Amino acid sequence: SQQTRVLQEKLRKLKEAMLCMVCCEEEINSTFCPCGHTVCCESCAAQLQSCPVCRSRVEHVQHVYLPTHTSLLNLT
Amino acid sequence: SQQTRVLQEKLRKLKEAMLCMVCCEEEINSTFCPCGHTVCCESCAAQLQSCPVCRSRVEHVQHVYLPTH
Numbered sequence: 001s002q003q004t005r006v007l008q009e010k011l012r013k014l015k016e017a018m019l020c021m022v023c024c025e026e027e028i029n030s031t032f033c034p035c036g037h038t039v040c041c042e043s044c045a046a047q048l049q050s051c052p053v054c055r056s057r058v059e060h061v062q063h064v065y066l067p068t069h070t071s072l073l074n075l076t
Numbered sequence: 077s078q079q080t081r082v083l084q085e086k087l088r089k090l091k092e093a094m095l096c097m098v099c100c101e102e103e104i105n106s107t108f109c110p111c112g113h114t115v116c117c118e119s120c121a122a123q124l125q126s127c128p129v130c131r132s133r134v135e136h137v138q139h140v141y142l143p144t145h
């Protein structure tokens with residue numbers, strides 16, 4: 001039905017919001033510290049000197065284990 | 077249709093996975109450091125001396141700003 005199409009769109013958008021803002025391919029699993037922005041996968045977070053969202057200096061990156069993780073890279 | 081019910085269940089489970097594992101009421105927005113388990117809201121994370129997933133000592137809590145918030 002049309003309701004099925006609406007729910008499919010909601011699911012798609014929620015899943016897309018969990019993807020890295022730089023490569024758009026890998027799940028977000030890294031936090032820039034101390035600002036807290038959690039918007040990148042490990043590879044894209046590795047070489048940024050400043051946060052791509054707020055421009056704060058990145059002192060270090062903290063890996064995050066989220067219950068929503070489903071990709072092979074985060075389960076293996 | 078039956079697919080509407082299946083999609084409602086998938087959406088409910090994904091939304092539930094974003095809720096605090098302790099209180100089940102607030103969105104996850106905190107990481108236990110250094111282990112990295114990100115499973116609580118700030119109020120439950122403040123009250124735990126040990127990670128509720130791996131039992132490692134919590135040295136400090138890092139707030140996380142997620143695009144899904």
Ligand SMILES: O=C(N[C@H]1CCCNC1)c1ccccc1
Nearest residue numbers: 096099100101102117118119120
């Ligand atoms: O009351 C709040 N949190 C509680 C609700 C019940 C579950 N444990 C946390 C709350 C959260 C954010 C800002 C202000 C108040």
Ligand SMILES: [Zn+2]
Nearest residue numbers: 020023041044
């Ligand atoms: Zn990436």
Ligand SMILES: [Zn+2]
Nearest residue numbers: 035037051054
């Ligand atoms: Zn930032």
Ligand SMILES: [Zn+2]
Nearest residue numbers: 096099117120
């Ligand atoms: Zn909580």
Ligand SMILES: [Zn+2]
Nearest residue numbers: 111113127130
């Ligand atoms: Zn832990």
